Design a protein around this ligand. Structure first.
Ligand SMILES: N[C@@H](CCC(=O)N[C@@H](CS)C(=O)NCC(=O)O)C(=O)O
Ligand SMILES: N[C@@H](CCC(=O)N[C@@H](CS)C(=O)NCC(=O)O)C(=O)O
Ligand SMILES: [Ca+2]
Ligand SMILES: [Ca+2]
Ligand SMILES: [Ca+2]
Ligand SMILES: [Ca+2]
Ligand SMILES: [Ca+2]
Ligand SMILES: [Ca+2]
Lengths: 219, 219
């Protein structure tokens, strides 16, 4: 009927969490994309600020519904496209387990990694020291606990909560790489996620673009 | 049958978002409380760290389900206690609208206000300057847009998304008060929230405790 429109830039880990979800749900053909290029300041145009006063990506518009957080976009796409499949959130406890880990990404992992990555990119951080990376390492410690108790981040099956987290892990991993000695379950989970058939197009392309910008700033 | 247990300290805005939700849903007698006192470091005890490696409140345990983010706790309590009432999230678009504003609180308003409040309390900030408060004021600007387009934060009815946001607004308002000239819709919404019959017990008690600690540090 009516197709959701995803406003996006794939250098963003929040955006790539959604792109991974879209591919995993098999709904690439049901979700139209609209590029909003951050480095060219397209997120500050009047139309986009009216759509989202946070002037941030991703945004999903579906009819008159406007969602302005990747984690809300992901749960909504699950509800309307994934009810009868491997990513279903119909059961209340399963939905809460998944939402719990989405909150972990939004409020812990993404918050802490974004501080480091933005600071490096805007040159306010010119040398990474121990204090810069401790909050990220503490988030890795929590993730390692979760992946000791279940095979994937929210339960023993892959869920949509694995996607925002791997989008963040593949971003801050550029500056804070996983040690297999320190975080063995997280390192093995990360390698497993990288083997998903849609990982290259939905996540690695944007990671590669970010890595190029980081190398230039840091040289 | 089996009662959820809420691990809590009401000086915390995330906790008070849940306490407001519990009162609004009429389920105070269905949710057992377990005090975890932050100032006495009870959140660092081995049992609690095993329950939640983030060593933070609130936590909800319901049978074997352990939720470790106020926003996930609130949506879960809606699903299992509020399906047939004024706070229902059964409709997918309504659920997404509410979740969208929960994400705003968790990832924007709470993140920005907590930085300021924690910094004042640990004395790392000894004088509030313009740069300290600009991110909070930008969050107020977004809230004002939301409350121009709907009567409450997520739609024209009160929802559970109003509760985490008012818990934060009543905390950082101590140092960054709302101007009725700058944010008229937000100021009127805030006064309306303060008139809810459960606001005093569920939120003001904890705000009062925090205000006392702030005054002492800042004198
Ligand atoms: N919690 C939000 C975070 C969104 C966000 O911060 N997006 C960034 C890119 S990673 C952005 O568009 N920033 C633009 C700006 O800050 O002006 C989500 O998960 O969608
Ligand atoms: N996103 C979390 C935030 C929880 C949080 O940060 N709680 C604080 C109190 S406001 C805490 O318990 N901090 C203890 C610590 O940082 O060790 C939620 O909404 O539940
Ligand atoms: Ca198309
Ligand atoms: Ca161009
Ligand atoms: Ca225009
Ligand atoms: Ca009781
Ligand atoms: Ca005591
Ligand atoms: Ca013990």
């Amino acid at each position: 009927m009516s197709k959701p429109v995803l406003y996006y830039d794939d250098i963003s880990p929040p955006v790539r969490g959604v792109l991974l979800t879209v591919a995993a749900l098999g709904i690439k053909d049901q979700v139209e994309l609209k590029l909003v290029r951050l480095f060219e300041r397209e997120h500050l145009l009047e139309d986009f600020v009216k759509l989202n006063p946070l002037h941030a990506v991703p945004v999903l518009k579906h009819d008159d519904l406007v969602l302005t957080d990747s984690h809300a976009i992901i749960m909504y796409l699950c509800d309307i496209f994934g009810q009868d499949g491997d990513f279903s959130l119909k059961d209340p406890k399963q939905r809460a387990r998944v939402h719990n880990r989405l909150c972990f990404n939004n409020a812990v992992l993404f918050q802490r990694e974004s501080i480091v990555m933005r600071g490096l990119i805007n040159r306010s951080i010119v040398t990474l020291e121990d204090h810069h990376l401790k909050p990220v390492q503490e988030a890795y410690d929590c993730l390692e606990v979760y992946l000791t108790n279940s095979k994937f981040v929210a339960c023993d099956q892959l869920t949509v909560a694995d996607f925002p987290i791997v989008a963040c892990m593949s971003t801050v991993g550029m500056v804070c790489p996983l040690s297999t000695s320190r975080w063995p379950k997280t390192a093995a989970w990360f390698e497993t996620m990288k083997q998903l058939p849609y990982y290259q197009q939905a996540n690695q392309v944007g990671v590669d673009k970010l890595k190029e910008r980081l190398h230039a700033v840091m040289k």
